[PDB]
Design a binder for these strands. Structure first.
Ligand SMILES: [K+]
Ligand SMILES: [K+]
Ligand SMILES: [K+]
Ligand SMILES: [Mg+2]
Ligand SMILES: [Mg+2]
Ligand SMILES: [Mg+2]
Ligand SMILES: [Mg+2]
Ligand SMILES: [Mg+2]
Ligand SMILES: [Mg+2]
Ligand SMILES: [Mg+2]
Ligand SMILES: [Mg+2]
Ligand SMILES: [Mg+2]
Ligand SMILES: [Mg+2]
Ligand SMILES: [Mg+2]
Ligand SMILES: [Mg+2]
Ligand SMILES: [Zn+2]
Lengths: 207, 38, 122, 174
RNA sequence: UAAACGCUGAAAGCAUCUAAGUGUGAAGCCCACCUCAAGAUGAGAUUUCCCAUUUCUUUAAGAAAGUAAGACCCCUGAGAG
RNA sequence: CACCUCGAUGUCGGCUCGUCGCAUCCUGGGGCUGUAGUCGGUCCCAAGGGUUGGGCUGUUCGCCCAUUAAAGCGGCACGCGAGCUGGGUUCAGAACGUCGUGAGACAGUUCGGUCCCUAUCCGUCGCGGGCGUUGGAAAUUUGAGAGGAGCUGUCCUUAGUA
RNA sequence: UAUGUUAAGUGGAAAAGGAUGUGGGGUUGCACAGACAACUAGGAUGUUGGCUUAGAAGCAGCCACCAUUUAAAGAGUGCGU
């Protein structure tokens, strides 16, 4: 497998070797850097730790500089691990350019969703509003909590709370174009996240 | 298969066998004589 | 976005003048239709000396809609009225001459006779 | 009557190797091994072998007969082998062998591929006459049954794969 | 694995899917897909950083009293609320 | 039967939310057929998911229309009124028929008619503080274990072949 | 401790009924001039007994059931024509 991680920019609207539009999301992938390589004999599993976005040193800290110093790079902001990849191909200090991907390949995209805040059950779970006339006093509410006999409410009864902030994949997307000069990927379709938010791109698990 | 607690043979060619702890009747000639308990 | 109890004009000479959607076909809980989607309907207003007459239950095809259609290239068609064409079990029409324009989306759904009989196909 | 006390002829060229368990058999066709239990007594002569049970219980009579039968199977397979002859019949049915990989045309939209292990052969003397051939009676029967289960017989017209020589009843469908 | 299909096979010289042995076999079960998850008090693992000071009491896993790494207060704010 | 409830017991139906069982409506597997093929009938396994919208009636049911792959049966105080409605329930008014000598009543019907509560505890959904994890801290993580999702039609081809 | 039984978690839920489950006891039949089960050879004739029916001619409906070599064959067990 493979992958990178990058920053969401925004949406566009693109023509692909024909007049057929493709809506597109822009991911800026300033070249990721390997920092650590984990193996079974020391760490329990094969994996590779990666950093994306350079901090200022005043924002970083000593024990992070010490972790970056092996690869001989600058303090990174977002740090993540990639699993189920070849370790003989990758080394500490290696820079992962966007050239790794080929326009057209199928891809999976993780991101943290836009915070919607403390929301009701209707918006949070698609529940239906009660009637708004005919004497109804039941408009935006989640309904009964359950039967009588348990004398208790069953779990996963869906209610109001924080909507958003969750980690979400989108599978079976497609890479539309690459710009290594600009370090940009164009991905067919919407993806989870606010702008200036982290995204992880990976080769598809299903494909 | 004829699943019935009153398993008992229907012709002379029926054999009775306890198979996986269940009683069964097996006739090669007539498979309608095939029976089981349940 | 054509629903049950939604009224439609008629775009052929079959005999009908106004139509009311009984149900949409396709699936179990389809609550909506657009161009290329077949309809089951009544006839609320018919031409007087018409074959198709008041009260008859009949199938139909949506040919143009305000909530219109979309193309791969972002080109979208829309209309100022919701109209339909009455058909038989086969995709062929009851009448003989379609009025007004028609969307291109029907050629994929194999209403080719209606596409031909229509004067303008957008 | 009894089976297990019946002696077991080699007859010659066949050889064996006792052990605490996992008895081995050898000869012209090849090798075989199997783990008979340590409850049976294995008496041996130069040409003849016998099994003796410790007592006259249900379980030991059973094991006695079963071990004699399996040992006889191993010997007979190493000497003469085994073969199951199949006969596939139909309008447009045929078969062909490519090494250890049998191909079957039996009416399904796609041709079907079966494959044997090293200890089993597919012969195909004719397009409709398959033969499995081998040395382990279990594996031979298993493969022949798996093959027969691709398109088994039918009563109305007979279309399907068979064992050569079996009986396949037929109904007078309208 | 279910039901079903068995292969070999004996009790019961045959027969038999089973008793031992062995195998096909379902939208179902455990995985595989996604998410939460070390408060998993059974509290895990790896990398990196700070270092082993002062006094008093004591052989005390002692007490306070300034600090390193670091964090917080406070302030400007939203991609958050 | 009258054991609990008359110093409260709220009565049907619908709505919102669902959850469970399997005696399985569909999908999935298989045997038998009086199964030629398509359709099927029946039985065994299977509860993973799904199991429609309207007219009439207060209605459950039921009939009808039109679809559906299918339009399951039941339980959870005939689930759920400190979550909603209050159409139906003879509260008080009035009237028809009928009964009564009558005041009034229904062996029937009809029009109209106040649904109170700031959530303490558990429970549920979410968010924190404290402490702990045996020196203090910054990050990344395995993953026990839990949950979620689990559906399905139509067309084409194989082939107008078997 | 001693002897046995059970193989279902019976024990630790429930019937009519069904079953080469298993242990005990008894009765009875056949059996080393060879039991039972299997394998081999035969399994027929005057005769395709007749009636029957277009056709039953061993086995649709209908009577009898002699004879043969015998080492044994029913004037025919079913399928099926
Ligand atoms: K309780
Ligand atoms: K009461
Ligand atoms: K309640
Ligand atoms: Mg209001
Ligand atoms: Mg398997
Ligand atoms: Mg009280
Ligand atoms: Mg069931
Ligand atoms: Mg309604
Ligand atoms: Mg109306
Ligand atoms: Mg209730
Ligand atoms: Mg009322
Ligand atoms: Mg009154
Ligand atoms: Mg009077
Ligand atoms: Mg009023
Ligand atoms: Mg409240
Ligand atoms: Zn039988």
């Amino acid at each position: 497998t493979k992958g990178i991680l990058g920053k969401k920019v925004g949406m566009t609207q693109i023509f692909t070797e024909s007049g057929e539009l493709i809506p597109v999301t822009v991911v800026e992938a300033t070249p990721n850097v390997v920092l650590q390589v984990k193996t079974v004999e020391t760490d329990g599993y094969e994996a590779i730790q990666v950093g994306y976005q350079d901090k200022r040193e005043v924002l970083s800290n000593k024990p992070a500089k010490g972790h970056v110093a092996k690869a001989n790079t600058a303090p990174k902001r977002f740090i993540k691990e990639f699993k189920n990849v070849e370790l003989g191909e990758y080394e500490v200090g290696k820079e992962i350019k966007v050239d790794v991907f080929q326009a057209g390949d199928v891809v999976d995209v993780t991101g943290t969703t836009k915070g919607k805040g403390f929301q009701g059950a209707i918006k949070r779970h698609g529940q239906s509003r009660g009637p708004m006339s005919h004497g109804s006093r039941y408009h935006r509410r989640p309904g009964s909590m359950g039967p009588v006999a348990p004398n208790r409410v069953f779990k996963n009864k869906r209610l109001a709370g924080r909507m958003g902030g969750d980690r979400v994949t989108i599978q079976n997307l497609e890479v539309v174009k690459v710009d290594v000069e600009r370090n940009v990927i164009l991905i067919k379709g919407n993806i989870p996240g606010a702008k200036k938010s982290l995204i992880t791109i990976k080769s598809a698990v299903k494909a | 298969m004829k699943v019935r607690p009153s398993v008992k043979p229907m012709c002379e060619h029926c054999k009775v066998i306890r198979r996986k702890g269940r009683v069964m009747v097996i006739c090669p000639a007539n498979p309608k004589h095939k029976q089981r308990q349940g | 976005m054509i629903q049950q109890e939604s009224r439609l004009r008629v775009a052929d000479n079959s005999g009908a003048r106004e139509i009311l959607t009984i149900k949409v076909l396709g699936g179990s809980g389809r609550k909506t239709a657009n161009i290329g989607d077949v309809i089951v309907a009544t006839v609320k207003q018919a031409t007087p000396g018409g074959v198709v007459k008041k009260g008859e239950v009949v199938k139909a095809v949506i040919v143009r809609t305000k909530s219109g259609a979309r193309r791969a290239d972002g080109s979208y068609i829309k209309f100022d009225e919701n109209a339909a064409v009455i058909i038989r079990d086969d995709k062929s029409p009851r009448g003989t001459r379609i009025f007004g324009p028609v969307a291109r989306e029907l050629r994929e759904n194999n209403f080719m006779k209606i596409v031909s009989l229509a004067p303008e196909v957008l | 009557s009894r089976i297990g006390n019946k002696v077991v002829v080699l007859p010659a060229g066949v050889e064996i190797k006792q052990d605490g368990n996992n008895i081995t058999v050898k000869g012209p066709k090849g090798e075989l091994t199997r783990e008979f239990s340590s409850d049976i007594k294995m008496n041996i002569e130069g040409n003849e072998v016998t099994f003796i049970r410790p007592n006259d219980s249900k379980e030991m009579k059973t094991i006695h007969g079963t071990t004699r039968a399996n040992f006889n199977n191993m010997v007979v397979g190493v000497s003469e082998g085994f073969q199951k002859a199949l006969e596939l019949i139909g309008v447009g049915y045929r078969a062909q062998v490519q090494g250890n990989k049998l191909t079957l045309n039996v009416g399904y939209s796609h041709p079907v591929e079966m494959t044997a292990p090293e200890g089993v052969t597919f012969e195909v003397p004719a397009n409709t006459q398959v033969i499995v051939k081998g040395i382990n009676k279990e594996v031979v029967g298993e493969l022949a049954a798996n093959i027969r289960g691709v398109r088994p017989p039918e009563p109305y017209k007979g279309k399907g794969i068979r064992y050569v020589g079996e009986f396949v009843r037929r109904k007078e469908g309208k």
